[PDB]
Amino acid sequence: HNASTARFYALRLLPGQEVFSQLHAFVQQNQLRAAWIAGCTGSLTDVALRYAGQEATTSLTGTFEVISLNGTLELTGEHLHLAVSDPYGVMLGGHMMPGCTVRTTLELVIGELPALTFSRQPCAISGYDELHISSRL
Amino acid sequence: HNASTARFYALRLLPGQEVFSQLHAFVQQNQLRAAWIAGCTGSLTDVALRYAGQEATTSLTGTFEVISLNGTLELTGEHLHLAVSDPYGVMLGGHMMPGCTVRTTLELVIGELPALTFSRQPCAISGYDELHISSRL
Amino acid sequence: HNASTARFYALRLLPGQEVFSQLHAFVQQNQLRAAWIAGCTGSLTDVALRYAGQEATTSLTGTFEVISLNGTLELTGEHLHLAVSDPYGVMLGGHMMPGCTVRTTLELVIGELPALTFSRQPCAISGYDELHISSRL
């Protein structure tokens, strides 16, 4: 039924740290196999996003607040989306890429589903490696 | 105290599937009585949103990334909000309506609160059927 | 490892209620020490946001839908971000401040991490009081 209890972790990233690398380090340290971002708040200086249907990554630098950071992650993969707001309330969003740097802080609550395992397997329909959910066993 | 442990489900919707119908099918299959979207990431082609205070639904078609999908759902009701971003980072958001179609994928982590039951009961204050939380018992 | 199980609460705020005060009342009533917004949907009339890097709070009044409300909260502190959409799909976001009032409803699922305790301690790096996570014990 792809059901499972959940174990949660709370963490705070520091100024200057790059988000993707830190999330991967956390996933590795705790050997998370089926995790997702359950909650997130903070700020960024550098932002790296890949807009819908775009192949290239867009790099931005400024004063940004993280409005939402959603998605799944595991030992060998992830799929995260980010939305940020600037000093005038304007928001931008897309597929989060490596390169986002913490401004003052990034608070996160990450959930792990012990009974499941996430992997990225080729989907003949979309043509990309998509989320595959199987029992941890 | 309206407190409860939570059971989580992970799922992936496929290209071409309509979100509301699939969420309802999942709710029905597992007989979820007090669920909420704990995490979500993906993409859409068709988007159906009802903007703030509007009576009519706005239908859009294009290349969109799902930035956030939040809300509650249960056997006989739901209340979900969606935010999407286009190929240029521009975002749009509102009350999600039936009609949103998956582009490449939609990854979801849904939580269910076994000790509670969600229902929609008339609120003399707002004038609409609002979320009512009671013990599962 | 800053890990913990989670206990969840579901609640609905009423028309006219101010969000910060109600969240604090809920935190106080249940003596929550390490909580976060796990899910949220609803509408607002008055919106109080502090944009990225800004010192002053921006006050708005109108017809808004809550697209996302994220962040942590505890007995003596909180850090929440809000994103809202107007009658034309336009979104605005920032650091949520006291002053946001419910329009028709605000549905929330709040998680509490029993094994942890959140506090705000001075960070010599950012220069502000930041999230500090310690064991509940």
DSSP calls for A111-133: EE-TTEEEEEEE-TTTSSEEEEE
Looking at beta carbons, which residues of chain B come within 8 Å of C66?
Answer: 81
In whole angstroms, give the CA distance from residue B96 to residue A52: 19
C47, amino acid identity: V
What residues have CB less than 8 Å from C8, skipping those under 6 apart? Answer: B3, B4, B5, B6, B111, B113, C38, C109, C110, C111, C112
In whole angstroms, give the CA distance from residue C66 to residue C108: 11
**Nearest of A89, A103, A111, A86 to residue A42 by alpha carbon:** A103
Please give the method by which this entry was determined: X-ray
In whole angstroms, give the CA distance from residue C136 to residue C35: 13
Q: Helix H segments across chain B?
A: 19-30
The DSSP H or E segment spanning A48 is strand A35-50
Considering only the beta carbons, identify the residue of B15, B39, B65 that sits closest to A94: B65
Domain ranges of chain A: 6-137
**Nearest of A2, A1, A81 to residue A36 by alpha carbon:** A81
Considering only the beta carbons, identify the residue of A7, A30, A67 that sits closest to C68: A67
In whole angstroms, give the CA distance from residue A136 to residue B8: 14
In whole angstroms, give the CA distance from residue B73 to residue A70: 19
Check if the beta carbon of residue A70 is closer than 8 Å to that of residue B68: yes
In whole angstroms, give the CA distance from residue B22 to residue A10: 31
Beta-strand ranges (E) seen in B1-137 are 3-4, 7-13, 35-50, 58-74, 77-85, 91-96, 102-112, 116-122, 129-135
Residues composing chain A: 137
How deeply is A1 buried, as exposed, middle or buried, from its count of CB atoms within 10 A (0-12, 13-18, 19+)?
A: exposed
- CB–CB of B2 and C9 under 8 A? yes
- Give the DSSP letter of residue B23: H
Instruction: Give the 3-state DSSP-derived string for chain C, with helices as H, strands as E and coil as C.
Output: CCEECCEEEEEEECCCCEHHHHHHHHHHHHCCCCEEEEEEEEEEEEEEEECCCCCCCEEEEEEEEEEEEEEEEECCEEEEEEEEECCCCCEEEEEECCCCEEEEEEEEEEEECCCEEEEEEECCCCCCEEEEEEECC
**Nearest of B41, B30, B102, B117 to residue B72 by alpha carbon:** B117
Check if the beta carbon of residue C36 is closer than 8 Å to that of residue C91: no
Experimental resolution (Å): 1.8
Looking at beta carbons, which residues of chain B come within 8 Å of A122?
Answer: none
CATH 3.30.1330.80 is right for the domain spanning C6-137: yes
- CB–CB of C1 and A67 under 8 A? no
B24, amino acid identity: H
In whole angstroms, give the CA distance from residue B26 to residue A41: 30
Check if the beta carbon of residue B44 is closer than 8 Å to that of residue B51: no
Lookup: tokens for C70 = 């994220």
CA angle B136, C13, B131 (to 5 degrees): 40
Q: How many CA atoms lie within 13 A of C106 on its CB side?
A: 26
In whole angstroms, give the CA distance from residue B76 to residue B64: 29
Check if the beta carbon of residue A36 is closer than 8 Å to that of residue A133: no
Put simply, whether A41 touches B (Cβ < 8 Å) is: no
DSSP bridge pairs for C82: C69, C94
Put simply, whether B25 touches A (Cβ < 8 Å) is: no
DSSP bridge pairs for B60: B47
Residues composing chain C: 137
- CB–CB of A83 and C81 under 8 A? no
In whole angstroms, give the CA distance from residue C72 to residue C80: 6
Check if the beta carbon of residue B69 is closer than 8 Å to that of residue B13: no
Query: Can you count the helices (H) and strands (E) in chain A?
Result: 1, 9
- CB–CB of B52 and C86 under 8 A? yes
Query: Can you count the helices (H) and strands (E) in chain B?
Result: 1, 9
Q: How many CB atoms lie within 10 A of CB B18?
A: 17
**Nearest of A1, A95, C108, C43 to residue B94 by alpha carbon:** C43
Per-residue b or e along C67-86, where b marks 16 or more CB atoms closer than 10 Å to that residue's CB: bbbbbbbbbeebbbbbbbbb
Q: Which residue has 């608070």 as its token pair? A: A107
- Give the DSSP letter of residue A131: E
**β-pair type (B129-135, C35-50):** unpaired
In whole angstroms, give the CA distance from residue C78 to residue C33: 11
In whole angstroms, give the CA distance from residue B93 to residue A91: 11
